[PDB]
Amino acid sequence: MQIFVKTLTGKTITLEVEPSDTIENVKAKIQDKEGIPPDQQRLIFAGKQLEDGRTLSDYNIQKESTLHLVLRLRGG
């Protein structure tokens, strides 16, 4: 199966992923797709950080879903 992600530049790209896949590989796929480093992504689904050490199946993600990409932030 595949998944949609909305990059920062307005474009949208589709990622070929499996539920068993971990988020680190997801960020690596974002990297080699367009190239912002694994550290700087912060994937958002339903207003939740997609934790690096987890997999899509953890977050209840299915086909034709959408993931949002932003720039890394922090508290204050």
Partner 1 sequence: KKRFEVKKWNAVALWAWDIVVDNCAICRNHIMDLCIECQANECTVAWGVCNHAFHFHCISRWLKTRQVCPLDNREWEFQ
Partner 2 sequence: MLIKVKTLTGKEIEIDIEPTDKVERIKERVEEKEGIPPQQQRLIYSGKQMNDEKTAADYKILGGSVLHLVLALRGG
Partner 3 sequence: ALKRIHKELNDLARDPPAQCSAGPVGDDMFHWQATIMGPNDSPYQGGVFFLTIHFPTDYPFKPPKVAFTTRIYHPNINSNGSICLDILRSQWSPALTISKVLLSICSLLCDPNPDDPLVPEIARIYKTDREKYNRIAREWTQKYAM
> Which region among 2-10, 14-22, 24-32 touches partner 3 (by CB under 8 A)?
2-10
Residue 37 interacts with which of partner 1, partner 2, partner 3, none, CB < 5 to 8 Å by class: partner 1
Closest CA to 1 of 13, 22, 18, 21: 18
Q: Which residues contact 3 (CB under 8 A, 6 or more apart)?
A: 14, 15, 16, 17, 56, 61, 63, 64, 65, 66, 67
| Binding of partner 3 by 2 (CB under 8 A) | no
Q: In this chain, which stretch among 6-14, 16-24, 46-54, 58-66 interacts with partner 1, using CB under 8 A?
A: 6-14
Q: Residues in the site for partner 2, rule: CB under 8 A? A: 46, 65-66
